[PDB]
Structures are given as structure tokens and as C-alpha cells.
Write a protein that binds this ligand. Structure first.
Ligand SMILES: Cc1cc2nc3c(=O)[nH]c(=O)nc-3n(C[C@H](O)[C@H](O)[C@H](O)COP(=O)(O)OP(=O)(O)OC[C@H]3O[C@@H](n4cnc5c(N)ncnc54)[C@H](O)[C@@H]3O)c2cc1C
Ligand SMILES: Cc1cc2nc3c(=O)[nH]c(=O)nc-3n(C[C@H](O)[C@H](O)[C@H](O)COP(=O)(O)OP(=O)(O)OC[C@H]3O[C@@H](n4cnc5c(N)ncnc54)[C@H](O)[C@@H]3O)c2cc1C
Lengths: 649, 647, 93, 93
């Protein structure tokens, strides 16, 4: 294994993978090494089977495909709680473990990067380049000889069209494609990063890296290897890199570094959380912070690790009927249900229920002028200066999971759907900074969630809207009182839980179903197809109970960005318009860290694109032509370059 | 989008052909298909053939059908309000139907007495659409079209058993009873199923999904119920307005969205759907439109009228327990469902579930001796409709290798049912809206049995198919409960389950063989070498059958004729090219246009009207239809020549 | 008739097994009212056949309610004939 | 514990329990399971602390609305209509 290569890519997430594979493919002469903190992901059945993605977030002392960052300090804006932010700890990063929803950022998002080479128009070809789009649409804004497979999976779930009828009934329009770069207001069947033919998860490692390593010999893969720091020149030129074991499990925990040198380039693709930490402990970041830690300054870039941005997720859970198809029992570990789906996937993956994330519809939404007034001073102000003149930007995202996304240990029996919600461009802002030069120690962290009052109303408003959807669905059998806002029990807004009939089905032999004693829930009246339905009215106290419910239950969406921002240095930026870290030579960040502002999308698409854009930038610095298509992707069928149907088995 | 070229309202077979053909013909032609029901794409409760039966359940769960009930009790049905379901899902009937392959006869199309609709006019189009995947001794089938037609994965032993008994009773065997020339013979019955993939040949996947995968110009809107066609000053169809499928808006308000159409509006909402859209659009019966407060666009009293169908009867017979039937599957026996679901996934090319389990039948027609005992009023019909139309059968008959009946009203054990329908009924019904609102239930009347001619053929079929049941190897008896009310002492009275079959059902049962109650006359235990004679029938036996027809005759979902293609002064609604009278840029192309009936399960008929309808619009827009159509999803690459099964 | 009036008033009552009762004219207000859809669905909850109308084999009872005000069945001279016939057909030791 | 129970229960204590020392304020027991509707409980095992106020100050009534013996009577539990009852139950929690 080489002590010296041409390019080192630090962190094998989507961006790092795009970079590492595209360049090694661009030039068979160029020695490139991909260094990834977590384990190799290749042909791991707990990666490529999409329908098990949920477990990747278990904090259970076994799962190690994730690092969990906790707020160092408690937050008054989350009513005393310490926000928890995980991210990938595996080759492919997010792409190996994520929820696999295919979403794309609106056009302004990119234009609004205020950087040349990064306009929507600049990037559109690269958007198409990475896509193996395998589903219908009524536009030409998608790509069809790219590595990354996108489809509707093997099987959409009935509650998805249920959701769509309800959505229509409250005035969000149907659309063939909410990912056309154009849509802020509309409802679609949500696609997935899954190959409709193979039923496999379209992770970025098999697409860009494994592809190339199977046909060439200049792409090196070092897994289970935390990149401590970048090694610099007498003139801040990145000259190589040090890396350690993932596990600090040496004799008396003595630090064990291995230096591997870069003739030409060093890229950091270790994520919004990882990348800033490599800079700081390498001597690049806040000068006074580096000074307190004993790290020699190399470049004083205080914006390193600042401007932590995310999407803020709320999960509204609704009970549903027992003849509904949900994931809840599979999620509960019911052997013969798991046995059924595992078998179905191995036998015929082209149509298997496990060839899905079961998040099979949703919408990007935008409030009416009518609805603004119900929001507050602070958000209307944000609207005016950020959304008003930007009609392709959605305020909130809403989707249906065909199950309960939550701890089933804290959920009653029965089946649920959940309205998964995130705020698309929050005003609130966090940060992350090393506490030490040793790379095993936890850094200071502050997710930042809700430290701007403006972020409350749009979320509050999503709650109301996603509820009006739920109540209008055929599968609906009440709210889950336990996991909803703390309404006054005699507010017309207060929760209506499971009905007696759905209750009697769950436990037909139980001695307990329908015992009033405790008055713990107000039952729903049993389901009627013919029910005329009117909206929930909310009082001021109801809105406070919701605001308090947001503070308490608002969460990350793993759409982390902005910790090494691409803007001029003097505006607190960390990179050039070619992703060069200011004050350095031969060093680049390419991953979502470089984002100067947010994007209204699930950010796998975005990190792949930022990736492709880096491949270009680096390649045209090294006199290197990127090839299209990429090395054929393992297990995948030979694509055609143009739109086509599901093939023969 | 807000404006397209062609809007096709309703995505049944007919609507799928039109929308698909036209978008594939010219990729700059924008066409939107608005379908009141749910998208059916890649749904295993659609594409797997052997679960079709669930689709007719009124269990308050199943949402794939809309059920029409007679407004008023019919005297002719001894006081009962008839129920007539239709499909409420993309692909219409073709996404939930029984998947029985059957074609009308040559004289049926000729007898439209309409230019461009002769049999010789439509033979090319009948072939254009088929992907025939089974042997035959004729050249009347198409081999490069989108709709797959096969004998399924696996044929049931009872079909060949039926075929033998049918021989015993003088009905000859045929290679192909769907060769346009056959009114009287028996066959292995094909299916709208693809031999190789084991998948149901729905029209949406065949003609729409296919094109949506290779092109951008075909738009689909599901869960959208078309309220009304919008009209010009000069009665030019200009657009369409659709509503949510569920009336679930704030306080049940009416949220219409409008989509304009630069070139054409096609109503393909089916026999029950199209008249209502016309009616609330202002095309229909002037008086009705006046009362409901609708602006009259074209006074067409033919709209809603001359509803026609096939009249089903369902004769249920108890069979041996070693017989292979669908009953236990239909009951929801766990390891039986598990087995067949599994099997279908692993090898759909031979799976039991790659079948409708309706695996043999006949088209039949009475001899002169049979005519004599069918009374005057049929005999009249016969001389005026059948006598010199010799390719028209009177009755269809087929064996279901299981009980097509609520098993919650069925004793235990296995069954078969002789599924029967009257081919060309004289009886007529109608359908009319009772409000502008597209959610209020319409006035309706099946009209079944309101012409007395229709009794004799169905009586004849009951008796005849009983002779075929009695002579099978599987026959273990007749289910008294579900048969006519013969006198207990009449030779005609049912012989139910024998003591031996019974004992296998419940080997540890305590009541198997208790006479007490005399609820059945036991069959004798089966014998291979038993001589079997015709059941004799008296005048009172005969009355019992007419009673049973009146009590148990049903739709066959073969609904048509509510917008008859004939001259306006005859009660017409569309011209020879399916234009709606007194309007521009508006065509009915679905089964509504049929001015008379067809001796066939009407999926084949629906697709063919679709194809002819595509041709008509296509010549008007100066478009050339492409052959073959866009590749059908999941399907093997078809050669265009008769061929055998691939690895 | 007397025992039928007893049946109809029982908390357990969910209908009259039409197959094992007198041959009443379907329109007759005395005609049997068989199992209700809700009782059926419990029997074969995974079954594809429960609640299929086709055949018109039984007039389903309406679901059970403790409130139901109960009026006695009116029988015509016709109905009386059907019970007579049923008695001669099904009377025993 | 008295001191923290507020003025309105204290007055009742002075008048009803002060010198009636064989009278308990509260009852408490362990149900070796959840005495609640399990349809609204997570999975796992529970125990419940069953508590009741021994001598409430609060007062209800029941009154008929009709001669007919099948009609629901007027009713009011009267639960907690006397603030004295809150303190001891809070103390039990
Ligand atoms: C659970 C989850 C659900 C989400 N679901 C969706 C979805 O449904 N749809 C969607 O579009 N997006 C989703 N996302 C977001 C998307 O996956 C991420 O935004 C994306 O993966 C980030 O790409 P990245 O290259 O910027 O960094 P990352 O994907 O985070 O990759 C960083 C890599 O570097 C490694 N690393 C970190 N530090 C070091 C170090 N010091 N040395 C070496 N290696 C290091 C990590 O192991 C990781 O492989 C989700 C993410 C997660 C985790
Ligand atoms: C249960 C069943 C069993 C049958 N079995 C067989 C068989 O085995 N073999 C066979 O050949 N034929 C069978 N048939 C008959 C055959 O399927 C029909 O004749 C055929 O589908 C007719 O096609 P169509 O276009 O005329 O209308 P349909 O197929 O009935 O489709 C009409 C479409 O219009 C939609 N629609 C209606 N009103 C509106 C509105 N206002 N707005 C928007 N959309 C609307 C409906 O959702 C539906 O999708 C069966 C049908 C059913 C339903």
C-alpha cells in the first residue's frame, strides 16, 4: 500500500466518492487514495437492501455506522434539551445509511450561491451527468447515463395515494416532478435512490469508487481510518496527510499516525461535521481557538466550523387502521414478517417491498398571503427579504412514512403513518470546534436549532397543514396523543386517539381494551367514508402548545451544511470559487461544508453535485478530461443513455 | 399543465388506447389522461392475476370499484334492487377484471350498420392490439401488439374435465372459439395474462405507462374525477374540469380545476361514467338538464339510455376434496396463500397464481329441438335476431375452478361454478344524474329481465351446464342452498354432498352425517362407471328456475350502449366517427358508443373501440399511428411472428 | 314465529341462516335477514370473497345495535304457506 | 408534610382528621401490571400505584329525569368541586 500518491480524498461520503472515482477514471496514471473514517460498505446486505435503512440511527451499543454529536451546552430555545446530530460513519457516508429520498434543490438555491461556475445554468449539465433516472416525468431536466440510480422503487404503498387525495383536498396541486428545479408548491410520488431493476440502494461508493477499482489499479481505498490532520509546506501547500485507527485501541492508547503524501492535491470530503475538524487540528480555523489548543497557525479562517445549517425535522405521528400496509411490524422485529420481506427481496427485487424507503409521497409547500398573516412579525420579515422574490423556494417539506418513524418501545401497539416535516431554509445557525488536537476527543458543538424566533411559525404551520392531510386520509384512525403537542384537553384542537373498533382488533382477547379508567386519551368516533370534514381551529394557547412541541421535539434532518462556506474570506468564508481553502495551496474542501446558504432539498443530490463540480474544478487544474459514462456500476444493468421501461427479469 | 392538445377523460381500456396511441404518434402533441381512480402502476394487487376476485368485495376497504344500485326495486327481479359495479382505478376493468380472453363475432361489428366499423374494417385493428401467446389453427390473431394473451401459467385439471362432459352432451371442441366465426363450441379459455412474466395485461401499462417511460408529452392525472366538459359559444369542447376523488375539502366544498384542450376532448369514462359527464356538461335530456339547472348545449335524450349488459347466472357445485380449486385460497387459509404468493414470485411462468382459474368454456346456441321448449317470446327474438346470424351464440358458459361466491355463505369444502351469461339480451336499462354535483348518486335501472325473452336462454343454460357438471369426474354434488327451489320430491331437486366427501371435510366432526333437519338430499358416493341421464324437468320445475334467474341474475360488468353510435333521430348520441352531436371537438370513445351487444367478454371490444377511436382522431389531426407501440414494462421483447415460450 | 321473535331480541343475534329457513318470497317483509358484513369480515378477515354481492344469495342483516327498537315480524297468508312447507320438509323425531 | 398542603386542605384537616387519628388521608397499592387500556400503552411490563382519596370534601348527586326506568338519570360525580381534595392526591403522586 503506497506511502505516496498524487491525490488524497479524505472522507468517502458522496462528494469524496465522486471526486475519488471521477479523477482516477479521468487518468489511469493518476494515483488517488480514498481515506474513510468508517468501515468499507461493499456488498454489505445491511447497506444495499434499502428497506432496512431505519436501524442505521439506533443508539444501542452495537450499530457503529454513525457518529452522534451532542450539544455541549443545553439550549434555552429547545426548552433545556441537548440536541443530538448524527452523521455517517461508513464508506459512502450518508448514502450508505440514509432514508434514500431523491430530492433536488430549486434553481435560485444555486444561483443564490452568488458565485460564478455555480449558477443553476453552470451546474445543470452536471446534475444530469450523475443521474440514472429510471421513472417517468414530463420534462427533460434529468440524466440517463449517470452512475446513481433513481426510481419509485419496487412498490409504492397505498397510503401514498391516500396522502395525495388528501393533499389535493387542502389545495396542494399534483405534479409529475417536484424535482424539476422549478417547484416550490406541489405534491408528488416521492422517488428513491434505488435501482428499480436490482432493488439495490444507490450508494455513492459502489457508483463511483467500487466501479473503478474493479477495472483499474490507481484507486486506493483505506477504510477504518480517521484522518487526523493535513500536512503543510513552508508555504501552506498541503504535502500529505496523517491518519489513525477508528478505534483508539492501541497499547495504553498511544496515538498511532500513518503519513501518506500527496504530490498534486488534497481534498477534504469528510462532511459538514468532519471537514472543519481536520482544518482546525491542522492549523486552519479560528486563530485564538488554535492558539489556546497549541496548534501552530497556518491560515486564520474564523468562519471554519461556523454557520452550521440544517433542515429542522418534526415528526407528527398518526394512528391508522389495521388493514393498512405499514412497516411498523417489520420495524418491531416480527420474525415471520421480516422473513417474508427478506425472502421477497432476494427472490424478486424488481418489485419487493424492501426495495423502498416506504416514504412514497409528499410535497414541497409555500404559504398563502392568507397564511402569512397567521405567522408572526419575525418570519414575515424573513419572507420579505429571502422568499418573497424567490418563487422557486419552498418554505416547508412534508412527506408520509408508511409506518411510525420513532422508538416502538415508546409507541402503543397497532400501525401508524407519520408526517415527516422539515424547514427548508432556517434562519438559525450553529457551530462546531475541536476541544483538542487529539482526534478521538469530542468537539464543542451547538446545533443552533431555533436560536432564531423566525424558525417557529413555518414549522407550527406545517403541523396544522400535515394534520389536515392526516384527518382527510382513508387510513386515519386518530392522532397519537402521547407524541403530539400538549393541548388543553378541552380545546377543539386536542387529540382524538384510536377508536374503540381499531382498539378491539389489536387485542381481541385483551381484558383491557376500552377501559376508560385514567382518561389517558379521548377516543375517535369510528371511521366513516361519508364524514364531512372541517378544519381544526387553534387558539393562541394551542399555538403555544405547538411552539413548545417544536422546541421539545424538533430534530436534525442530517442535511448538515455550511461549515467551510464558499464566499469571500472577509465575509467569513473558507473557500474560493474553485473550493481552495484560503491561505493554502493544493488543498480543497468538497462536500456540503462549502455551501454558503441552504438548499430546499434532501441533500444527497446536492453533495453528489458539489462532488461532480469538484471533479471538474480539480480535473481542469490537472489537464484532465472527465469521462462519461463512468465505469459500469456493480450488479447494475448496462443503461441505454435515454428514457426506457423496466426490462425483462 | 393548464392547457394541452387532447384531454382523455377516463383511463379504462378505451381511454388508454387513445391516449397512448396519440402521444406516441406525435411527441409534440400534449395529451392528458384524467382518471378518477388511483394509479395502478406496479401494484401487486393489480399485476398478479389470481387475486382479481377481491376487487368486487363491498367490505368498506376495497376502493377499486364504484357500485351503482338501482334507485327502485324491479318487479322483474321479484322486488330486488340490482347492483352494477364498474372499475374505479387506472386501466379501468382491465386492472381488476376476471381476465377472460373473448372476442365478439364478425356479424356483431357489421350489425353496427355504421361505415368504418364492419368486421373487415376492424380485423386489422383487432390484430394491431394483441400479443397472442398460445397455439391456434387460424390466422385471426395479432403477434406484435401491446396486450398479452395466453393460457396462463398452469391450467386446472377441472377445465379438461369440463371439456369431456361438454363432449358427452354434444358440444364440439375447438382450437379457438374466438376466431370471429364461432357461435357453438368448447375451448381451453385464454386470459389477458403474459405467458412469460405471469402478469395481468392491463391496458394502462400496455399503452400509457410504456409511452410515459420514453417520452415527456403524455401527462397522467389520477384521483381526479371529471365533473364536466366546458363548451364554447359555438359548442366547441374547450376544456375539462376535474375534482378530488374524495369529497373531503373543508366542509365538502367543490374544488374544480380546469384544463383546456387546443384540439380534442375524448370521453372514455365508461358506459356508466360518460353519460353523467355529458349530462352535467349540458349534453343529454333537455327536460332533465332543465330540472337540474344545466345549460342545454345539445339536447340528446339518447344519453343515459339503452343501457345493455350480459346477464350472469352462477351455478355452484360441490366437488371432491382431492380436486384442485381456489376456495381455500379465497377463504384466506394462511399457508395456501403463502405457497401461491411465493410460487408466483419464484416462477411466474408456471405459477397457479398466473391464472384467473377460469380455464375452459363454451359458446353455445340451441338446436331446433331445444328452441321448441323455450316458449314464444324468445322464439320471436330468435327468428328476428339469431336465425340467420349463425355466428352469434345465445349463452356463454365456463367453469371456475372454485366458488365465485361469498364463502361466508358457503358450507366448507371445495366447489366449481358454472359462470353463465346471456349473449344478446333484449332487456334494456338506463342511467341519469340527479345533480350537477359529480358526487351525488345517479338514478339507475339495470333493466335486467324487463323483457321476458331473456328468461328461456338462461333457463336452458342452467339445465345444460348442470348436465356438464353432473358428468364431470370432480362432481360430488349440487349446493341446495344456492340452487333453484325445486319441490323436494321432484327428480329435478338437488343432490348435495355425499356422506364420504363430507367425512373428509371434518374427519373429527361430530355432526357430519346427522340427518336431523333434512337440509339436503345426499348424493350417492362417486362411481367411475355410473351411467348418467338427463334430469327431466316439469312445468313447475321450470317455474322454479325462472324464479332463481329473477332472484340471482347479475351483471357481467360488460356494460355498454349509453351513447349509441346511430343517427340522432333513432336516439343516437355520436356520429360514425364518434363525434357527439351538436358539439365540436368532442368524442365518446369507450363502450358507451355500441348501438347493440357483442357475444363476448367486452375487454377485447373496449380495446378495439379504443384502436378505431385512435385512428379516427389520428386521421383528423393528420397523425400516423406507430407500429409497434412503445415497449410494455417488464415484458419480453416480442418477435411479431407466432412463437413458443422462452427460457 | 314465536321463537324467531325470541331470536331477533337476543344480544347475540346476527341473523337468520337463510338456507335453513322457510322459502319466503324475497320481497316479503318476513324474508330471512342473514349475516351482516361486519360479522362476516371477522370470519375470513384475509379472504377475497367476503362481501361479494354477486349471486344475491342472501339479504345481509344490518350491523348490531343494543338500541334497535324491535317490531314483531308481519307474516302474510303466503308466508304461512312457506312455513307449513318448511315444517313438512324439515320436521323430525 | 401538612405545611406544604395549602390552606383549604389544612382547614379540613383541623376539622376532620386533626383528632381522628385512626383515619387515613390517602390509600396506595401496587397493581402488579398496568391497570390501563394496553391499546394506549407501549410494550414491556408495568406496575401501577393505585391511589384514592379516603375522605373527599367534594359532593355529587344523582336525580332521575323521567318515570320511565330506562332513561339515563341526571348525574354529577362532583369530583374535585372542593379545592381541599387536590392537595392530598398531589401528595400521593
Ligand atoms: C440517516 C440519514 C438520512 C438522510 N436521508 C436522506 C434522504 O432520504 N435523501 C437525501 O437526499 N439525503 C438524505 N440525507 C442527507 C445526505 O445523505 C447527506 O447530506 C450526505 O450524505 C452528505 O454528503 P457529504 O459528502 O457532504 O458528507 P458525508 O456523507 O457525511 O460523508 C463524510 C464521510 O467522511 C467520513 N469521515 C468523517 N470524518 C472523517 C475523518 N476525520 N477521516 C476520515 N473520514 C471521515 C465519514 O465516515 C463519511 O463517510 C440523510 C443523511 C443521513 C445520515
Ligand atoms: C370486475 C370486472 C370483471 C370483468 N371481467 C372481464 C373479463 O374477465 N374479461 C373481459 O373481457 N372483460 C371483463 N369485464 C368487462 C370489461 O373490463 C369492460 O367492458 C371494459 O373495461 C370496458 O372498458 P371501458 O373503457 O369501456 O370502460 P372501463 O373499463 O369501465 O373504464 C372506465 C374508466 O373511467 C374512469 N371514470 C369513470 N368516470 C369518471 C369521471 N367522471 N372522471 C374521471 N374518470 C372516470 C374509471 O375510474 C375507469 O378507470 C370485467 C369488468 C369488471 C369491472
Amino acid at each position: 500500500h503506497p506511502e505516496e500518491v498524487d491525490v488524497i480524498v479524505c472522507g468517502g461520503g458522496p462528494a469524496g466518492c465522486v471526486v475519488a472515482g471521477r479523477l482516477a477514471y479521468a487518468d489511469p496514471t493518476l494515483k488517488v487514495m480514498l481515506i474513510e473514517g468508517g468501515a468499507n460498505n461493499r456488498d454489505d446486505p445491511w447497506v444495499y437492501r434499502p428497506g432496512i435503512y431505519v436501524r442505521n440511527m439506533q443508539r444501542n451499543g452495537i450499530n457503529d455506522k454513525a457518529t452522534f454529536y451532542t450539544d455541549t451546552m443545553a439550549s434555552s430555545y429547545l426548552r433545556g434539551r441537548r440536541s443530538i446530530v448524527p452523521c455517517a460513519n461508513i464508506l459512502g457516508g450518508g448514502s450508505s445509511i440514509n432514508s434514500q429520498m431523491y430530492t433536488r434543490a430549486s434553481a435560485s438555491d444555486w444561483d443564490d450561491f452568488k458565485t460564478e461556475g455555480w449558477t443553476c445554468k453552470d451546474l445543470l449539465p452536471l446534475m444530469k451527468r450523475l443521474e440514472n433516472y429510471q421513472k417517468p416525468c414530463n420534462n427533460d431536466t434529468h440524466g440517463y447515463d449517470g452512475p446513481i440510480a433513481i426510481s419509485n422503487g419496487g412498490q409504492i404503498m397505498p397510503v401514498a395515494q391516500d396522502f395525495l387525495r388528501a393533499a389535493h383536498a387542502i389545495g396542494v396541486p399534483y405534479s409529475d416532478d417536484i424535482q424539476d428545479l422549478t417547484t416550490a408548491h406541489g405534491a408528488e410520488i416521492w422517488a428513491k435512490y434505488i435501482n428499480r431493476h436490482t432493488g439495490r440502494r444507490s450508494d455513492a461508493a459502489t457508483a463511483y469508487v467500487h466501479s473503478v477499482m474493479d477495472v483499474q489499479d490507481n484507486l486506493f481505498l483505506r477504510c477504518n481510518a480517521r484522518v487526523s490532520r493535513v500536512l503543510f509546506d513552508d508555504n501552506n501547500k498541503a504535502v500529505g496527510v496523517a491518519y489513525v485507527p477508528s478505534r483508539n485501541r492501541t497499547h495504553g492508547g498511544k496515538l498511532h499516525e500513518t503519513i501518506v503524501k500527496a504530490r498534486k492535491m488534497v481534498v477534504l470530503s469528510s462532511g459538514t461535521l468532519g471537514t472543519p475538524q481536520i482544518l482546525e487540528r491542522s492549523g486552519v480555523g479560528n486563530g485564538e481557538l488554535l492558539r489556546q489548543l497549541g496548534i501552530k497557525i497556518v491560515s486564520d479562517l474564523p468562519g471554519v466550523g461556523e454557520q452550521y445549517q440544517d433542515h429542522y425535522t418534526t415528526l407528527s405521528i398518526y394512528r391508522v387502521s389495521n388493514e393498512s400496509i405499514t412497516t411498523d411490524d417489520f420495524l418491531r422485529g416480527v420474525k415471520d414478517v421480516q422473513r417474508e420481506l427478506f425472502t421477497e427481496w432476494e427472490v424478486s427485487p424488481e418489485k419487493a417491498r424492501l426495495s423502498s424507503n416506504a416514504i412514497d409521497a409528499g410535497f414541497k409547500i409555500r404559504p398563502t398571503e392568507e397564511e402569512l398573516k397567521e405567522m408572526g412579525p419575525e418570519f414575515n420579515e424573513l419572507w420579505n427579504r429571502y422568499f418573497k422574490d424567490k418563487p422557486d423556494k419552498p418554505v416547508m417539506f412534508g412527506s408520509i412514512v408508511a409506518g411510525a418513524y420513532a422508538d416502538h418501545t415508546l409507541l402503543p401497539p397497532g400501525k401508524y403513518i407519520t408526517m415527516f416535516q422539515y424547514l427548508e431554509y432556517p434562519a438559525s445557525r450553529g457551530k462546531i470546534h475541536i476541544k483538542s488536537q487529539n482526534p478521538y476527543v469530542e468537539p464543542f458543538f451547538d446545533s443552533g436549532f431555533m436560536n432564531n424566533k423566525a424558525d417557529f411559525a413555518p414549522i407550527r404551520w406545517s403541523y396544522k397543514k400535515t394534520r389536515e392531510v392526516a384527518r382527510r386520509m382513508d387510513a386515519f384512525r386518530g392522532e397519537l396523543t402521547s407524541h403530539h403537542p400538549r393541548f388543553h384537553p378541552a380545546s377543539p384542537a386536542a387529540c382524538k386517539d384510536i377508536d374503540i373498533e381499531t382498539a378491539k382488533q389489536i387485542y381481541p382477547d385483551g381484558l383491557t381494551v376500552g377501559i376508560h379508567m385514567g382518561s389517558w386519551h379521548q377516543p375517535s368516533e369510528p371511521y366513516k367514508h361519508d364524514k364531512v370534514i372541517e378544519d381544526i381551529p387553534y387558539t393562541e394557547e394551542d399555538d403555544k402548545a405547538i411552539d413548545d412541541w417544536v422546541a421539545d421535539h424538533v430534530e436534525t434532518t442530517w442535511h448538515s451544511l455550511g461549515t467551510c462556506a464558499m464566499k469571500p474570506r472577509e465575509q467569513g468564508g473558507v473557500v474560493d470559487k474553485r473550493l481552495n481553502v484560503y491561505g493554502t495551496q493544493n488543498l480543497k474542501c468538497v462536500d456540503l461544508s462549502i455551501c454558503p446558504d441552504n438548499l430546499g432539498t434532501n441533500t444527497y443530490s446536492s453533495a453528489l453535485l458539489v462532488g461532480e463540480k469538484g471533479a471538474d474544478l480539480i480535473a481542469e487544474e490537472l489537464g484532465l478530461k472527465i469521462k462519461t459514462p463512468h465505469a459500469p456500476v456493480p450488479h447494475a444493468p448496462v443503461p441505454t443513455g435515454r428514457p426506457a421501461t423496466q426490462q425483462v427479469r
